[model samples]
Structures are given as structure tokens and as C-alpha cells.
Target: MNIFEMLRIDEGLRLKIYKDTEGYYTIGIGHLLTKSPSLNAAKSELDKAIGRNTNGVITKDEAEKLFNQDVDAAVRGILRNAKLKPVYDSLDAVRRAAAINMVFQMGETGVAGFTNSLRMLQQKRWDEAAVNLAKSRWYNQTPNRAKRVITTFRTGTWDAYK
Candidate 1:
């Protein structure tokens, strides 16, 4: 119906970096990162979002704007999904935030792949859930972030990240 909805439907919302059809390093709802024609405003905005100066890019501001909007919508989607909502709602704030952050990074289906961890969490088995989380593929890829999330599950506190 509108641009945002259209982009969501066509491009799909991806908060993390991924390869597009042509294999460019893209992020945040289809923002492609590569060498470009060097438009001043686009370059400046892209630099701010990426925390560096670069040439030949597009849609940093739009990517961030869409990412913010999509993450909120994604949380709502997770809360509305029948399989995820109960588990999502059962956690304390820190655990809930960790789940939300994971969903943001990995998408609902990706997080859903955490079958054992999700079961442990729903069962209120915090230590088991933390162990399961640490053993995950997500953890293998990003140990630091996984540790922070595991700490949230273990302590119900956000201090590990702070």
C-alpha cells in the first residue's frame, strides 16, 4: 500500500548484514554497502550510520529509519505469534529484552530455531536455558553477544552489557 509496507514485502526486513542477490554486503532492510558515485549527503548519512567514511553507497538514513520501525513491528509480530508469545511474555524484563534483541538480530524464525532453549525458557529453567543458549549456532557465531544474553537469562539483569 505504501513505501514502507512495499519495502517490507519485497526486500524483507533484515537488521543484520547479509548478501543480496548480487552478493553485496547489505544491512538494515536492504541498504547495500559498496563503492559508489560519492553523493555528499548520502555519503555523510552513511558514514554516520556505519561510524566511518565511505564512498559509493545509498539509503543509510532510510535503512536506520526502517530498521527502527521494523524492529518495533517485529517485537509486535513476535508477541502475536502463537508459538512465541507465551514464552516471550513469561520472562523478566532483562530476559525479555534479550529475547527481543535476539529476534532483532536473527528474525522470528531464526530465534524460533532455538527449540531447546525456548522450551527451557518457557519451563522457567533459567540455568538450562542459559546452557542451551550457549550451545547454539548463534552463540558460535557471536560469542560476546550470546554471553551477554546468557547472562541476562541467568541473572535477570542487564548489567553484563553495561
Candidate 2:
């Protein structure tokens, strides 16, 4: 499968509204419309997306559309950020997808904080990059996802892809 498909596995699919681990209102493939930093605008957008109020259900196709939007946004957001661009541009497909996956999980700003890891990735030090990723609260919180993502960083391939 492709990187996007791999992400589908990593994020999992949910067709209705639910709260995330952090208690924010989320829907479909980890889309947090009510994230801590912001909510109404994000929520408004999601409400618009579903065509009516927010409580109603959405189709799998609709969820896929939202998921694709987030993934592409993650890709675009990373490239657009001055701090993240160079190393992001330096990686191969597998590594690039690994980066994209990281941004998908924790916004670009969050991943950009990993100075050592990004530097190691830029230098093609896959093992070192993976090791640095292990030294993160993100890893501690979502060990399963972090483990697979870290392995992908090391091996330059899809992790736990079904």
C-alpha cells in the first residue's frame, strides 16, 4: 500500500463524532475539530464539512475526504514552514512519508521542536533519527504508533502496514 494507506492504518478510521485521548472533539481519522489551541473555527469548518449540525453521522467516503485533506495539509504545511522545509525536502519517499506521518500526529510545530532528530534525518542517519524520536513525550503517550513510526524512520519503509 501507499504512504496514505499506511497512514489510514496508523490513524484508524472513525465515521462519527468522538472525543480524542486528550478529550477534544474529534471525528474521522484523528481529525480534531476541537483541539485545545483552537476550536470554534475548526469546529465550524467540520460542521460545514458534514453539511448540517455537528452531531450527525458522516459517510466513509466523507471521512476519507477529510482524512485526505489533513494529510495533504500536513504535507503542504511542512513544506511551507521555513523551519521544517530543508530537511523535509532532503528526505526520500519513505523518509518523507515518515516525516509526513509525524506532522500528521503532532502538528508541524510540534515535530519542528525535535532539532536533533531533524538534523539526523537531514544527514541520513536513520538509526540516529529513530533513536532521537524515541526520546519524546509523544513516544511515551502513543508508544504503539511511535514504535511503528520510529521503525519506519530507521528502516526507510512502511511500519505496521496492513
Candidate 3:
């Protein structure tokens, strides 16, 4: 993935849990807590407790661990989902990264739900893919982030990431 674009769009270095664009709670590099399963799963697997009112204050190092875990799980889930795997695998490396984050705020089923967009992307119709996503409630709610993602789908270039 392109580092600058990835960092620029999301993954700001917030150390405390804060409301991200889609109104979900997150801490550090966009690690999911209230919505996705990454952080809590780690705590459960590692035999730790989920904090309710620990002030959500965390050290940078701890956030790093959680962020690392979150991305791994995100990619794993994306790759493994039967409905999404075919669509994910058919894209170029550039758009593949694009696809991951497209489904990040929600789940891969979010992508799977778009019956027509996948068909457009499958046919390499980047414009249709872009436009289909552009009209989404997801895109409307988070214009800045959605625009960057839509740009990648349309251009097939890293310029959008830059």
C-alpha cells in the first residue's frame, strides 16, 4: 500500500479513543473497537479485559500493537470472504489496496452488497465502479475519504493516494 496516502486519509496518530468520520469509536491509526473485532479479540485471546471507562488513554506503543492486529484481521477477513475474494483477487495491486479500505469502515459484505459495482469492476470499467461508489451513502457521508478511494478506482494510478 502507498504509505503517504494511507496515512493521509486515515490512521492519524490519535492516542485516545475518538469519533472517526463514520461516527465509530477508534483509537490510534484507525483501530476499531466499537464496530470491528480486532482490538477486543486481541484482549480476549491474550486473556485481558476490555476497558469500559479506562479513559481510553493509551500509549503509542500499545496503539501500535492494536493497529497492527487490526490491519491483519482486516486483510484476513477481506481475503477469506467467499463473496469478496473473487472481486478482490481480480483487481490489480493498486485497486486491490483500494478495495480493502473501501470495505474497512464496515465489512467486506458492504462491498458484496453492491451487486452492480463488482460487475463494473470485474469488467475493468473503472468509471462505472467510481460512479457506482460515488453515489453511495458511504461516499456522501464521508466525502473526503470517499473521494480519495473513488479516485483510485477511476484513475488506476497512485496520484490520488499522493
Candidate 4:
């Protein structure tokens, strides 16, 4: 019923938690990623339990869902569900891999909404791909926050990762 519960932070982090979202219970879009005890006081607190910027996309409960109670499998599930598939598949192998990282951070729905951006991608336009992708913005409502990660995926530079 509280913001900590919404973010799924465990008891170990309870004392470290701050009024991240104006004291309301929910995720905030601009929660800067860092471990500054002053600038980001909460980061130090969270680190005690989750490690510095652990980016623990999947929580312990997620691990329990899989048959073997494996956190790695849970993480795989989180990555597999990431929404960059359509854009990722369209890219060259290198870009696809890079996109996996972007998608991992952005989440599935965040990566899937770039309609016009993806259109430009089909043409293999590199600059347009990067530019268009940058057009996406963060959209948040109530405790739920949404962000548009990329609009397109069509550039030779993406191949660098391949």
C-alpha cells in the first residue's frame, strides 16, 4: 500500500528509502542512477541491500516464479519480455545486441511504441534511425511511469556491436 511496496524494495531497503516521488507511493521517472549519499541519499541505503546501481530488474519473487527458483532465470525472463524485439530483429546483428541493453533498461512497452521511427528504420537510414529514436520521451501517470526509448533502428553504426 506504500511507494516502497510499489517499487518492490524489500525490508532491507526500507530504512534507506526516501520520499523519492514527492512522498507519494510510486516510481519516479527522474530517479537519477547513482550512489551519492548526499545527492542521491537513497542510493546508499538501497546499496546495502541491492548493491550499487544493481539494476536488479527482477526481484526475488520473480525468481520464485520459475521452476528452479533461479534469479538468473528470472532476469532472463525480464530481458526476454523486453519490448525491443520488433526493432531489435530489424537491426543488424551488432545493433540488435546493443538494443538488447537499451531494451533491458527501457522495458518492452517502452521500446515497442515507435511507429514512425520504425518505419524509417526499414529503409536502412542510419542518421534518421538514431535521430528518430531520440525523439521518444518519458510519459508518466500516477505511480506508473512510461518513457519512449527509441524511435528507429537503422544505422550502420549499430553494427559495431556485432
> Which candidate leads in TM-score?
2
Clashing pairs in 1: 36-56
- Model 4 CA lDDT for position 68: 29
The lDDT per prediction is 0.67, 0.82, 0.70, 0.39
Ranking of all candidate structures by their TM-score, best first: 2, 3, 1, 4
Q: Which residue pairs of candidate 4 clash?
A: 3-25, 83-108, 94-162, 133-151
After the best TM-score superposition of candidate 3, give how far the Cα of residue 104 lies from its true spot, in angstroms: 1.9
Taking the tens digit of each residue's C-alpha lDDT, what string does model 3 give over 87-151? 87888888877777776666777877887888888888988788988878888887887888788
lDDT tens digits by residue: candidate 1, 1-162: 222433344356565455665455565675554434334444565577666554534355656675666668778978887888989888776677777777756678888888888899999998888888888777887677678668877888756655
Worst 10 residues of 3 by lDDT: 43-52
Clashing pairs in 3: none
Give the per-residue lDDT digits (tens) of candidate 4, residues 65-118. Answer: 321222233335434654434444566654443344343334445556666665
Those runs of model 1 whose alpha carbons end farther than 4 Å from true positions after fitting are 1-24, 28-63
RMSD of each: 10.0, 2.5, 4.4, 12.3
What's the true lDDT of residue 63 in model 2?
90
Better of 3 and 4 by TM-score: 3
Instruction: Please provide, for model 2 over 1-35, each residue's C-alpha lDDT reduced to its tens digit, 9 standing for 90 to 100.
Output: 56687788887888766677667777898887766
Give the candidates in order of lDDT, highest first: 2, 3, 1, 4
Over 4 Å off in model 2, which ranges?
Answer: 36-45
lDDT of 3 at 83: 75
How far off is model 1, as Cα RMSD? Answer: 10.0
Give me candidate 3's TM-score against the actual structure.
0.81
Alpha-carbon shift of residue 44 in model 3 (angstroms):
11
